[PDB]
Structure 1
């Protein structure tokens, strides 16, 4: 065609109001939101929902999300958790299959011996079914 086809990779961008996971430290596995940028490697986050304070942090232990919301720069914690829940964002991270596997390995860790035998036999029967099913198919 006459249509020029550019392909730019799509990266999770640092920006105001950006929803973020903390992966290390005391607030490991939590969520916060970036408000303002300090530098390339430093930012300000806040997790009043998740219980993470308002603090400066490092992008190496921080890991970004594909999610984001909108926000006025300089906002304080009231407005923070406000627009957060207004956006209803924990719900969306819950919808994130990422987080589904998070809680998956969580539960899988929290399993019990007898639960594992249960899983064993359940998967056995399921397997027989799927075996003969796909054998037909």
Structure 2
């Protein structure tokens, strides 16, 4: 049970606030409510656990490591690629891509989806009649 724990080196997703969608690394624990997080593109600061969603990724680091050490550990663990390839991480990227689509792109996607739906319906009907 409890597949995920808050740990030194645990990678978490910010699920609320202005920093939503960013990956951070838990480098220390202040108390039961907040921890010390870090990432390559921010300053190590505290965050409440209520704004963090633990991921399945973990890196091997000591508490409050240097920026270079943290970056090296993240690169060795390939955190970015692992998160992006996972369905959970791909979900946010796909949501952003859908939000970014323009009118002509939306029309082309509609055409492609209609054609695929028609072909799939024909295929399924043939399978059923088989």
Both structures adopt the same fold (TM-score exceeding 0.5): yes
How many Å separate the matches in 2 of 1:12 and 1:39?
Answer: 18
Kindly provide the CA deviation profile for residues 65-122 of structure 1, in whole angstroms up to 9, marking residues without a partner as x. 1221221223122211121112111110011111111111111000111111111111
Tell me, yes or no, if the aligned pair for 1:22 and 1:31 is still in contact at 8 Å. Answer: yes
More helix, by proportion: 2
The alignment status of 1:25 with 2:27, answered yes or no, reads no
Once the two structures are TM-superposed, the CA of residue 37 in structure 1 deviates from its matched residue by 1.0
How many Å separate the matches in 1 of 2:12 and 2:31?
Answer: 16
Once the two structures are TM-superposed, the CA of residue 35 in structure 1 deviates from its matched residue by 0.9
Kindly provide the CA deviation profile for residues 7-44 of structure 1, in whole angstroms up to 9, marking residues without a partner as x. xx333210111111123334321111001111111111
Aligned to 1:122: 112
Q: Which runs of 5+ in 2 are unaligned?
A: none
TM-score, normalising length: structure 1: 0.85
How many Å separate the matches in 1 of 2:64 and 2:97?
Answer: 38
How many Å separate the matches in 1 of 2:114 and 2:95?
Answer: 21
Say what the alpha-carbon RMSD is for the aligned residues: 1.3
How many Å separate the matches in 1 of 2:126 and 2:51?
Answer: 50
The count of corresponding residues between Structure 1 and Structure 2 is 127
Q: 1:84 aligns with which of 50, 74, 80?
A: 74
